[model samples]
Target: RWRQQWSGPGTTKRFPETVLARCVKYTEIHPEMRHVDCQSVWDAFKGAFISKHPCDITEEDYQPLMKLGTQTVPCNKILLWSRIKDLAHQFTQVQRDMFTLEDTLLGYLADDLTWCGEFATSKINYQSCPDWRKDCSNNPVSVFWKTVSRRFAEAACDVVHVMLDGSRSKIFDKDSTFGSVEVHNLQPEKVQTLEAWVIHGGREDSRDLCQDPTIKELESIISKRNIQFSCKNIYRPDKFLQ
Candidate 1:
């Protein structure tokens, strides 16, 4: 016998939702996200990542699947962000009136689930998924986010606010999910103005405000796109919202 038991949990990297039960449950609480069948959404979501290798997958491979459960976010409350996931999401989560891609039914249900594909078989690899660096071509996780980010930006209207973290490098880092996808997908025709509330890691936040090399490039796009760009800097423990 090849070792009586040689499986590693067998659920290590499994898709969290084998059925859309979680999606359905999300709707019961959110109410606003009550459209589309949960089981169907799960089916499509799982299929996109199971049959192929992570590095070989394309964004187009997951686009149609997102359409199954995508819904419109309300205008003026769309909060897009880059570099700072916690602050951006925390704002949306606590505000009650604000919404992010994560607030949507599919997005909420799909977050934090690890899944992979079996190159040899049409199976969902549950033992181990590729790491962030290994799946550089945007693994199933990144693919879903990029797909949702595009859709979310396209659906934006009125004044779209973005919370960018200035603690790292540039706000306009082209490699970011926002820079590569959301920013590009933002329809100037739909969005009235794009606001950047840059957050600094220290009290010198104001000093770093409105002054970044990348801001110039960002402004160029805003101008060329015929949309307005505004910047506001926030220091740690800052509470301009309250």
Candidate 2:
């Protein structure tokens, strides 16, 4: 007998406004905002958790864990939890000065996305109540998009780190490439270009997967920046170049 718990034992209250208000208040007081917008801080924190290069993930390490969720296709709660835990550990490893941005991003996402309660009641059968739309003024989708934008910005920064600073290897070589590049040479514009490419690529991929016209329209916004991250044509021994 599986049951959803919302409050005290055997109690049945949903979306307790008091709890929600307190959560939002705590977000307002998050310490990362000392030198930046609180929302910005939150966005940065969440980005640190969710944004990672796809190539960095190995199938064996991530695949089995991701197959546990039942609500969504390819449901994988174990994988999601493992990823989040790994990010939490990584967040603690950053220097104090470097931690603020990532902290802010995480705060923003937790506060804005990942809804629980009546809003998160069901994956396929939940119905919006009369006030649902109004309640969604602070919906998680809004926060999710914010995190995506921030991640794009961060990816751009990484690209600049590779380009202007001159990476030791075109491909990441864990040993020799570890400390080869200088950080100060990272250019803001190049970072922006890289971010645009990520956002554009992400949008394109989402469009292909979801086949949503709305996503296609969004892809158009970053199409001009696509050239910045394009791989130059290279000959392949086994296949013809398109």
Candidate 3:
């Protein structure tokens, strides 16, 4: 693959078409997203990273897309998470009260998709791209998530909920998108309480909990930001694990 030295595998083929289809579908079906111009949204999103160095992308690059796809997140409804995708989706589906990033417009359009452009070329590299975790923090995908996750945190109000995996060695990773981006971006004025739920698999040996030092550090960060903090332990055996 002809790509930058640090670039990994390329983006998904037909990415733009997929983005447009998903964008239009989301707007047509969701009342809240109806006001969004799907084409313009796609244009802005594409303009952000196309023709840029895959490993050198930045949050500012996606700011325009962030503006176009901006939707107000309901207060007391935001759910942040780390490493528990299926469980989080299921919880929101059953609970019906909380909304995760994927439930929102930008997250909806970009979820499970990947793309990046090469320097000085108006083309999405379908041959190779950069790895977000290993290659660069500013990779297209990482920057996109960071930009939107921060916005998501900022727009939240009232009570906020976060789900963490208790089986992980580190329940609260300050470096995760949830910890580094969302938690820090939470607006103390709009957000009243930061609720952390440590979810442990029914059969797994649990590690961190409400009182664990890692969790305490999370609380400390929230408190220092002038937001009230709360923690709870949720045990759901194999059923919730699925």
Candidate 4:
């Protein structure tokens, strides 16, 4: 079947066949994903945003793609973060058993594909996507993330770890990926508690999210959802780095 990629109209290319192959291989190796069809999943992925107005696409619009396969996130092993994406990645690497979105099948395939509208033809544009914050509220890329993130959080169980950047204002900003989507989607019956690990880049840093009103609100929300919340602060960077 013809495919689409995130590229300019004239120079755009079809979605790589190799990517489809990788998705297939990923499931082949994961016994739990025995039923997922990598090709169909990829097609659903493209349908999420193809030929649609960037601003017209909503996060829920990607549900078809997100629902393609089930992701078995481990209990107490869910790792979430914001701003410190790379650092959080390192944490997952060192603790290979810890599951982040990237460790899942869909997450692995769509990790870093930049995409947007076609310049001339009625297809996809891969040259470059609109800047994240430009019309940021609506776009295929942002919508895709919101959908995937919501699912990732909903799959968490027992206990989960959330790593936040202490250096940022309102460190637990409800707008953050960790704060906004993931935290909200956590299930009460399934999740026992949230371990909020505030990672301060320096020893002298004294930002206290545990004291901030917004963080408190997050705590309130969690408790309201009947899930326990524990807040911790790391003043130095030695935890992730040796």
TM-score for each model: 0.83, 0.26, 0.91, 0.79
lDDT of 4: 0.73
What lDDT, from 0 to 1, does candidate 2 have?
Answer: 0.26
Q: In model 3, which regions exceed 4 Å deviation? A: 1-7, 202-208, 237-242
- Residues 98-209 of candidate 2: C-alpha lDDT, one tens digit per residue: 2222233233334322332232223211222112233332223233333333332333342321211111122222222111221112234443322111111221222221
TM-score (C-alpha) between model 3 and the true structure: 0.91
Is 1 or 3 the stronger prediction by lDDT? 3
* Candidate 3 lDDT score at position 173: 89
RMSD of 1: 4.2
Whose TM-score is greatest here?
A: 3
- Evaluate model 4: give its TM-score: 0.79
Error of 4 at 236 (Å): 3.3
Clashing pairs in 4: 6-125, 6-126, 7-125, 7-126, 7-127, 8-127
Using lDDT, give the best candidate's number: 3
Off by over 4 Å in 4: 1-18, 21-31, 34-36, 118-122, 131-133, 207-209, 238-242
Residues 111-223, model 3: lDDT tens digits: 99988888867988887777766788678888898888888888888888998888777889887998788989999889989998789874756644788888999999999
Model 2 misplaced regions, further than 4 Å: 1-88, 100-102, 105-113, 116-139, 146-148, 151-242
User: lDDT of all the models against the reference?
Assistant: 0.72, 0.26, 0.84, 0.73
RMSD of 4: 4.5
In model 3, the clashing pairs are 8-129, 9-128, 9-129, 10-128, 202-237
